[PDB]
Amino acid sequence: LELLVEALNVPAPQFLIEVELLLPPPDLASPLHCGTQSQTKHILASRCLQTGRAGDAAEHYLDLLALLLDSSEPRFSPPPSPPGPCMPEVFLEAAVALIQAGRAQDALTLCEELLSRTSSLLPKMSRLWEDELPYCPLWVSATHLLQGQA
Amino acid sequence: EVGKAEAERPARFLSSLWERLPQNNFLKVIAVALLQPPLSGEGSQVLVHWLLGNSEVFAAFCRALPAGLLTLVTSRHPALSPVYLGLLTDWGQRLHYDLQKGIWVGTESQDVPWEELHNRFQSLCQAPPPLKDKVLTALETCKAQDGDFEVPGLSIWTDLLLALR
Known part of the structure; x- marks a missing residue:
């Protein structure tokens, strides 16, 4: 996977009937689905975290977020698809x-930036005073949880 | 008349009355007599001594009556204030919070509910300034005593102070 990322780093229509014109665009079950560098850097980081190489996974994930959020000028690097994580x-x-890894003082800055950026979406927690009905997506709760374990 | 007689002390008459006649009625009547202005306030002055002497009646005094009556009583007689907050302070402490329903509750059925206790503290806060600071300090000192949290689910006293605002 480390090699595959570097491989995908690098980026004629003949007036004739060739094979490519007839072959179908591939599905997700296919072995020929290969998403973009970002959609594979996430595979690397996910598979590095599932095994217990969390230091390496941390560097991979920060590289990923750098790609996604520092994408204003150059050609775009998309996030994973909505089968995968939001x-x-x-x-x-x-x-x-x-x-x-042991980088809790960075795991707080992640979570702070996430809640900063989605403030306008968070509920106003006035139901906190009035106490099932109101709406809060799981990730807000989960943010406070990780913010605690840090 | 018993005071002028001086044969037996008033407290003995009142204690006998307490056994003899209906308690709920009697307590409302004491509450009311504590506020009637003098006409000869030695009468009220005797009942405060009797009540502070007898804790058991004062447990049902503060429990049975409504809020504003106790508030006016306590503001009229500052000697009843430090005990009344002490009575309330003990009733909170024997509650427990359940996470599924966002409500403090008691274990036993005769433990004062959240709504009644909130009503009492709200009445005490909507009062003259001499008692507002008293109740407020008694609540803050009991909050800090149980961890100085600023978030609900941990301290009944934080939850009170949150609900007052």
Whole structure:
């Protein structure tokens, strides 16, 4: 996977009927689905964290977030697809990795930046005073959880 | 008339009354007599001594009556204030918080609920300033005594002070 990332780092239509024109675009079950560098850097980081190499996984995840959020000028690097994790879940995974590494003072800055960026979405927690009905997505709760273990 | 007689002390008459006649009625009547202005306040002055002497009646005094009556009583007689907060302070401490329903509750059925206790503290806070600072300090000193948290689920006293605002 380390090699595959570096491989994907690098980026004619003939007036004729060739094979490529007839072959179908591939599915997700296929072995010929290969997403972009970002969608594979996430595979590397996920598989590095599932095994217990959390230090390496932390560096991989911070590299991933650098790609995703420092993407303004150059050609775009997309996030994983919506079979995989949503964009907050990525931050959470990053912070879990940084906890297991021993970088809790960075696992707090992750979580702070996530809640900063989604403030306008968070509920106003006035139901906190009035005490099932209101709405809060799991990742807000999970953020406070990791923020605690840190 | 018993005071002028001086044969037996008033407290003995009142204690006998307490056994003899209906308690719920009697307590409302004491509460009311504590506030009638003098006409000859030696009467009220006797009942405060009797109540502070007898703790058991004062347990049901503060428990049975409504909020504003106790508030006016306590503001009229500062000698009843430090004990009344002490009675309330002990009733909170024997509650427990359940996470599924966002409500403090008691173990035993005769433990004062959240709503009644909130009503009492709200009445005490909506009062003259001489008692507001007293109750407020008694709540803060009991909050810090049980961890100086600023978040609900951990301290009944934090939850009170949150609900007052």
